[model samples]
Target chain A: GPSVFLFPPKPKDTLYITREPEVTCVVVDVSHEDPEVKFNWYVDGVEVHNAKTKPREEQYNSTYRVVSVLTVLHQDWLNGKEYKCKVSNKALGAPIEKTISKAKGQPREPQVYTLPPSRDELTKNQVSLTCLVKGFYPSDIAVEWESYGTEWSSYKTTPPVLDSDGSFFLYSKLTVTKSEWQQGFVFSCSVMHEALHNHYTQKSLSLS
Target chain B: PNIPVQTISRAAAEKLFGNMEGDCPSDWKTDSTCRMVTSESKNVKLTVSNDSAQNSVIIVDKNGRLVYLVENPGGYVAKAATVTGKLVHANFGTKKDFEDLYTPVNGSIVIVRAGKITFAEKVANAESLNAIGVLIYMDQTKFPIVN
Candidate 1:
């Protein structure tokens, strides 16, 4: 059976292969048996003719996996046309469909979590504390580093990394001395995104 | 609702603009004046033909061509005539709000947000500033046409 379907395409345009910037949608299927699936792409309720789909390599497991993608010209997307993805299996009579439009795509909030330095890293003179903000849509996120006893200039935030399912994730790292870590200093990552109520979220870490 | 002591029963209050009780329909899109203008972006722009939507007042050129299509939704249109001037925002139509944000009124059309004062007061203040006409809209909605 076909599993999780994907939308949101890639955030930044890199595939200029068609001389026009493109937005893409990916479909993934994993099953014990080889999946017999058909994919269809539509724009504004009309079927697209020149959609490009590249079949991804299957991994060796009892689970057979298949990946397919379709692209559209960026101008058409900017013009606010609805893009539709339809997938069906040979056994299933009904097809599963997902529709996305420039103005109508729903927004999803990010999940925020923090990871402590490893025991070995904690034993070193310098240690790194990591914060992960995962599974956000629309990708306009702001992550700010705050500290109670930790130094201000020792932290760094990373650029957003795209998830395979078309969401986004980001990581922020705070570095401090082992002496400061042993002293039980506090650090936090405050995230701001439109999807969340109040548009703000925070995660903090201290000595367990 | 609050009523002042000076307010009495049986007093007749005449409205200058009339016969538009059911002019603009609840569905703004279907109405002739309320139409979406889709052009540049993915999001469609919504607009309304001011005169057609409200059927209140209009300004005409020397040859009787349409000049300004004014939608008189609620406020009274004092008499029927051509009222024309360069439009200027007077910011709430208050004397102080006007003093802060303009070079001069000079027979200009003044636009203001309704509230914190009476409609008659706003009109009088704009007239004091040498304004030819006043456009006072209430606290807005997501679409100006909806309000």
Candidate 2:
């Protein structure tokens, strides 16, 4: 005898991925639904921040914040790194995780770091510029040097080694020739790291 | 030949009542008016008395009919909900209370004394009990602190 076939139909749900070069502010127009829905925000691959139950278009919800401030750090994210927004009204079922790629660029403002008191007394012979910065990921950090507003030298370190507690630290030093140090010169070290759109730490030391 | 009621045995009457009714109540006490019959089943019987016992057992049919059966000694109530089928017990006073404390799932939930159980250990045991997840709640009575 010939066999008869029966099969359950598949679900027709569709998930879309949208990309944006800049931060796209959303009204989150949830006024039609429940007023108690909460919006959670994730950047890169971490749940670092969240906002709650401000009604759509209401005075409390008036001010807009960055859904994501994407920069070159996010450009080369780790494999399976996800940035998601989960909005939930618990009265509803499980909260849905949605992806919003339209993150805006937050160009870094110019950074200035003042040298420690010991390093303040700059002598003309063989000047040394030491830049110290903290709180960044992936150590292979580079700090460029400029003398009197012009690029002079650059120093960088190997890939950073994370500690047992999952934090990274690195330092870099730039050496200048004795003659180059005598011109009442300005030695600046501009430190760059990952996920820093408008973030850099630059410090300058002067030669006497 | 006609059988006389006086000639019928007491054991025979008790046997007859046992056959008609279910097992006799455990606390049945013997009295002078109590009668027994062995007319039908030998192993089963019932007692009949004009005086009412302290706790009388009555069986009722769906037709609003009442039938006197055995007298219960004490400690049983009608319309009691049995805990026989429950494998694990969870006591949440109200549905809102349970919902507020734990995530909802189609699976089962068990509540253990938080004072006696650690959160991580509780989660591990609950996972073994075919539960999808676990929730640990602080008791209202005790102040939990670290040494």
Candidate 3:
């Protein structure tokens, strides 16, 4: 069987704004043992020539990676323009098309929630802390847990999941022993997203 | 939105210096020829906080070409009197891009092509790398000239 995968599998569509009133869309395709993969970049149904094609070699395996970058003006992107990269390989019956567009407004801050509201729900042996961030755009975010100002890396985070309104949601969870929770240490979940202005949102939970 | 309506009476100035000559209204004849005055002195203050003494920074080229402008009227800026180091181009300033840079970005000012992410993300990436500052620019190929 032939298999192909994209590095960023979720949010198959995205729109990026650049510093100079410009927007760029990047699409990458990777497949095993397919060196003859061809990519065609298109904008608004018309083929575009100003696209860059690069081939990357995987060190461990015999996989072929192709990346296509398309650049456009910011105004054009705001005008509801569409850009797509169609990838075709002999191994597949149909061409794979990845498209991206600008989502409404800049990315929004995430709304966080913790499951199982009260400490009474926790067992004496273990307690789980969940942080849910929702309604953010761009789909790029960092979620971490902290205790006493120190980052706790031993936590699991779900990949950014798309929402119905073109925004994203992410969930992270950290489990601590009941002894640690009883130590009166406050656990905080901090979310960092692109739309934030050099700031992050922190929600804290502590045993009262 | 709110709108207000009111009626008031005030004196009006007359033009002088041969710029224009106008007779004062009969009911309000208190004004004679007016002389325009000009003042050249202005005052500004730089406030310091425990965060940093220096604030508000901009980047320009050798020919005085403006490259980047900091957001916010009065925002946090590095206090370095002058920073001189090689510029590392970090595309999008993504965490992965910062990690891929083979060379050290510490003590240097990173220049990243802005787009796809927030400026804060870019700044955070540079800060994580121990860079002195960050300069974000648009891709000239797509944006062309500012003017």
Candidate 1 residue-wise lDDT, B3-22, digit = tens? 00011011110110111112
Candidate 3, residues B1-147: lDDT per residue as tens digits?
011101111110110111222332333222354222111121111122333423322223343222222211223332323343344445556787777665567766555554667766667768876876555444433322221
Q: What tens-digit string does per-residue lDDT give for candidate 2 at A1-208? A: 1111111111110000122222222333334335454556566657654333332444364432212232212342322244555555544467656664322333223223534223443454444556655545443245565542234433343344455544555555665544444533456676654345534456777654
DockQ list for all candidates: 0.00, 0.00, 0.01
Write model 2 residue lDDT over B1-147, tens digit each, in one string.
010001122332332244342232233232232222112212211112222232222222222222222222232211111011011212221233333433232243233223343444444544444443222233344534333
C-alpha local distance difference test of each model: 0.53, 0.35, 0.51
The stretch of ten residues in a row with the least summed lDDT in candidate 1 chain A is: A10-19
Give the chain B TM-score achieved by candidate 2: 0.24
> Candidate 1: how large is its RMSD?
23.5
lDDT of 3 by residue, A58-142 (tens): 5445555456555566456554566676777777789777666555467687787765334674645776778888998766567
Candidate 1: lDDT over CA atoms?
0.53
Greater lDDT among 1 and 3 belongs to 1
What TM-score, over all chains together, does every model reach? 0.31, 0.25, 0.39
Candidate order (TM-score): 3, 1, 2
Name the 10 consecutive residues with the lowest summed lDDT in model 1 chain B.
B1-10
Stretches of candidate 3 off by over 4 Å are A1-34, A42-55, A58-82, A90-95, A105-109, A114-125, A134-142, A148-150, A158-170, A193-199, B1-147
Q: Who wins the TM-score comparison?
A: 3
Candidate with more favorable, higher lDDT: 2 or 3: 3
Positional deviation of residue A184's Cα in model 2 after best superposition, in angstroms: 2.6
